[PDB]
Design a protein around this ligand. Structure first.
Ligand SMILES: O=C(NC1CCCCC1)[C@H](C1CCCCC1)n1c(-c2ccc(-c3ccccc3)s2)nc2ccccc21
Lengths: 11, 230
């Protein structure tokens, strides 16, 4: 649900 | 009174991460150059704000200790602070000194950008209260870090972990205020008091965007996660 944010936090 | 060697280094690291942002003049150049329609201005805003969030995430990941926080709490800090950081950065840009007459034109361009009349007056009140503080670039960078590392956001499960990351930055900011403005021993408290005004924008930000005087309010996928829109 907060995936783009979760992605940028991990990358 | 002095900053310790570790505090200098800390301040010294945070400024470098902060300066990865788009330069203020790049932004005020575009706005001052031509007047745009309200629809073009809305597009300029969403493009600017999407780049800002991307850089804010990279800035946040470099904050000492942030990456060791619980993963759900990291999301909650970014979501809870993104809009506040955008207005603080906008206030920084607005208060950069420009050639004679340029700031007046910039204010007029923003007044005529498409934003609703309801919101223009509080926005300029805040910008102007921020300019009165005569903040340095180090103070803006620290305040942004302190805003991001606020333990009192919702859904923070472990506030105590966040507090211990925020406190060393508060201590450095307090030392700078005493060094940079020794005649005003209320300066630190006044900076912190401005943060409560930032929080009010977060709470009205959705209505501020949807009342923009355009026919369609299209946001990017990244902004839809950060902003309470669409
Ligand atoms: O581009 C901008 N800001 C960037 C954002 C990311 C970080 C860098 C700054 C806009 C432009 C204003 C004129 C029309 C185009 C957009 N801006 C604002 C805002 C007005 C309204 C704003 C808003 C945001 C969210 C929700 C509800 C409302 S921010 N204040 C400025 C002060 C000085 C220079 C630009 C400034």
């Amino acid at each position: 649900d907060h995936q783009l944010l979760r992605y940028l936090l991990d990358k | 009174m002095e900053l310790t060697p570790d505090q200098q280094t800390l301040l010294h690291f945070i400024m470098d991460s902060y300066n990865k942002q788009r330069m203020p003049q790049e932004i005020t150049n575009k706005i001052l150059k031509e007047a745009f329609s309200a629809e073009e201005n809305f597009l300029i805003l969403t493009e600017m704000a999407t780049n800002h969030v991307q850089v804010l995430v990279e800035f946040t990941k470099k904050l000492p200790g942030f990456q060791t926080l619980d993963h759900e709490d990291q999301i909650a800090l970014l979501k809870g602070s993104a809009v506040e950081a955008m207005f603080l950065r906008s206030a920084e840009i607005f208060n950069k000194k420009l050639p004679s007459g340029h700031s007046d034109l910039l204010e007029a361009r923003i007044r005529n950008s498409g934003i609703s009349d309801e919101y223009i007056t509080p926005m300029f009140s805040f910008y102007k209260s921020i300019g009165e503080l005569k903040m340095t670039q180090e103070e803006y960078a620290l305040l942004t870090a302190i805003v991001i590392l606020s333990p009192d956001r919702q859904y923070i499960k472990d506030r105590e972990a966040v507090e211990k990351l925020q406190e060393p930055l508060l201590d450095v900011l307090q030392k700078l205020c005493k060094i940079h403005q020794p005649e005003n021993p209320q300066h630190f408290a006044c900076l912190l008091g401005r943060l409560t005004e930032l929080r009010t924008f977060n709470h009205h930000h959705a209505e501020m965007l949807m009342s923009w005087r355009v026919n369609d309010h299209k946001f990017t996928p990244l902004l839809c996660e950060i902003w309470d829109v669409q």
